[PDB]
């Protein structure tokens, strides 16, 4: 029975948060400067709280709402809020799957769309924006999203992304209707295919030119940017979002397990496997990213050498990258009148700056892996395999999330006595798909950015803080430990008690305080926006109406707890 539960938890946890979100989160916050907090936040926040969730699922042996209502009525709201967060997640998570579907369907063409830039219009060169950026970046930002230059500028609903999202939701609904317990052979298959595909891309990814640059960027803990509180916040929230903490479905999964089971081994194994998968996927992604950065640096050096050679009438191969500065000094000393004209034009490029600003954003995984695919032999087969692995991961994660959404609805006899479950699931999927059309607009990527960073980011911290305070102080940690010891014969270790009671809540509170102080001091929340004319990413301040949605997304889910307490107090009085 252990294999079933462990693989169910692994299949829930291992999803797009490991393969897609972790790489771009690591790239955004300095690489190593993000990886050091991650591990630090995994020993303190991941393992103890995952074990606490799994133990609460067993000693109650009820659902999330049932457990947090049986501990105390004044707390029942944290069962409702844990559903709402899932809702918001399911509102935007599917968009990622949609994108993969798109990238799959544009994978049966000999001239792969992200391989060759379109012709400029003279039929003699390439597009300006497709040349300033990469072909992969041009495909992702223009052919895929058609991203608007600013959040204030939005067009209509792009029909192709809308159809892809509709298809993804239809696939999710079909998976909901079809199977619920036939995951027997799937768990043997769906757990090894992502590792096999990542192994193949690692075999390709570690033999590219300049692959070591990406790994060095990944594993170097720059102290200068290690002091950023946002890095710690993002690390903790990614840990919570990847382990599934706060969504309330881990409690339901552990509710079906025997009370004579070792939840200390299972929690450790699940957290470690999740961490290892994230690290491995990010290693492959950053090896390809380092290849991209090295290629960009070499291209800039070649362009500068060509510029000098075409002007100074130097030999064809005389000016190389190993003698660039010396020959520049020699040319400047020869005659300054000619050198003065183009001195603005000569561009400085270094590996470090390219590494920070080669590729960044929520499309890092897609851009990087499409670049890697375009450097394969049979690009079509590898593209299909990778974007099929990604599809399986996303579909599994969404099945878990939607099960967490739907179980409270099905368990409610008020709704179950009026409509069939097949209609309840259909209505939920229809509402989610209709609302998620806001992510398919021209400026839909910015709303996806807002939801990926605020819908299920800090609410997952506050939900878990309330849960752990509830377990330790309201219920009584001595009573909980005695119940667990009677259930499994072994008393909880002193380390787990220490991490449950004081360390994890204090670290969460400190993180919240630091984030709030940083936001107040900065006083200007900014987002990345594509610039096709400059062909890169620029920082722009959020408009007035974008802060209201950002506030409401967190506020509804978090404030759902105190409101229930006030309602219960009113009902009592």
């Amino acid at each position: 029975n252990s294999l079933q539960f462990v693989f169910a938890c692994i299949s829930y946890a291992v999803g797009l948060g490991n393969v897609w979100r972790f790489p771009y989160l690591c790239q955004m916050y300095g690489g190593g400067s993000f990886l050091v907090p991650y591990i630090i936040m995994l020993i303190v926040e991941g393992m103890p709280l995952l074990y606490l969730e799994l133990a609460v699922g067993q000693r109650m042996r009820q659902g999330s709402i049932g457990a947090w209502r049986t501990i105390s009525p004044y707390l029942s709201g944290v069962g409702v809020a844990s559903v709402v967060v899932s809702f918001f997640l399911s509102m935007y998570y599917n968009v990622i799957n949609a994108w993969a579907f798109w990238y799959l369907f544009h994978s049966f063409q000999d001239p792969l769309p992200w391989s060759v830039c379109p012709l400029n219009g003279n039929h003699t060169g390439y597009d300006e924006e497709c040349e300033k950026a990469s072909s992969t970046q041009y495909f992702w930002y223009r052919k895929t999203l058609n991203i608007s230059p600013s959040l204030q500028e939005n067009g209509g609903v792009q029909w192709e992304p809308a159809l892809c999202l509709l298809l993804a939701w239809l696939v999710v609904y079909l998976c909901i209707l079809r199977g619920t317990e036939s995951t027997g052979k799937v768990v043997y298959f769906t757990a090894s295919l992502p590792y096999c595909v990542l192994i193949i891309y690692l075999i390709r990814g570690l033999t590219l030119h300049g692959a070591t640059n990406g790994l060095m960027y990944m594993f170097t803990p720059k102290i200068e940017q290690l002091a950023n509180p946002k890095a710690w916040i993002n690390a903790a929230t990614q840990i919570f979002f990847s382990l599934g903490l706060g969504f309330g479905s881990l409690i339901a999964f552990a509710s079906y397990n025997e009370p004579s089971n070792n939840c200390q081994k299972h929690a450790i194994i699940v957290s470690l496997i999740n961490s290892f998968t994230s690290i491995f996927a990010s290693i492959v992604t950053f090896s390809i990213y380092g290849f991209k950065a090295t290629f960009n640096y070499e291209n800039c050096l070649k362009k500068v050498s060509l510029l000098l050679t075409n002007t100074f009438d130097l030999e064809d191969g005389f000016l190389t990258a190993s003698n660039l500065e010396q020959v520049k000094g020699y040319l400047a000393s020869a005659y300054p009148s000619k050198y003065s004209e183009m001195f603005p034009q000569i561009k400085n490029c270094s590996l470090e700056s390219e590494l920070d600003t080669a590729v960044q954003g929520t499309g890092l995984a897609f851009i990087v892996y499409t670049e890697a695919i375009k450097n394969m032999e049979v690009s079509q087969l590898w593209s299909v395999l990778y974007f099929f692995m990604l599809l399986m991961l996303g579909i599994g994660s969404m099945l878990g999330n939607t099960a967490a959404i739907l179980t409270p609805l099905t368990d409610s006899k008020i709704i179950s006595s009026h409509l069939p479950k097949e209609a309840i699931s259909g209505l939920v999927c229809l509402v989610n798909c209709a609302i998620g059309m806001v992510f398919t607009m021209e400026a839909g990527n910015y709303w996806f950015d807002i939801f990926n960073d605020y819908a299920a980011t800090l609410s997952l911290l506050l939900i878990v803080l309330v849960e752990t305070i509830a377990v330790c102080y309201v219920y009584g940690l001595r009573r909980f430990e005695s119940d667990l010891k009677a259930m499994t014969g072994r008393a909880v270790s002193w380390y787990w008690k220490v991490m449950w009671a004081g360390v994890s809540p204090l670290l969460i509170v400190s993180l919240f305080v630091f984030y709030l102080s940083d936001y107040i001091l900065t006083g200007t929340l900014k987002y990345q926006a594509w610039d096709a004319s400059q062909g890169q990413l620029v920082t722009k301040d959020y408009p007035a109406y974008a802060l209201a949605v950002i506030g409401l997304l967190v506020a509804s889910s978090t404030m759902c707890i105190p409101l229930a307490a006030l309602g219960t107090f009113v009902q009592r009085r």
């Binding site: 369907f105 892809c164 239809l170 609904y173 209707l177």
Partner: peptide, 29 residues
Amino acid sequence: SIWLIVFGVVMGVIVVGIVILIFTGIRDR
């Protein structure tokens, strides 16, 4: 456009699957 053909095929097969599953579930009950 080849992507459109592949998407049409996939959406058709998925829709037929959903329809048959709903119909079988309703008919069983």
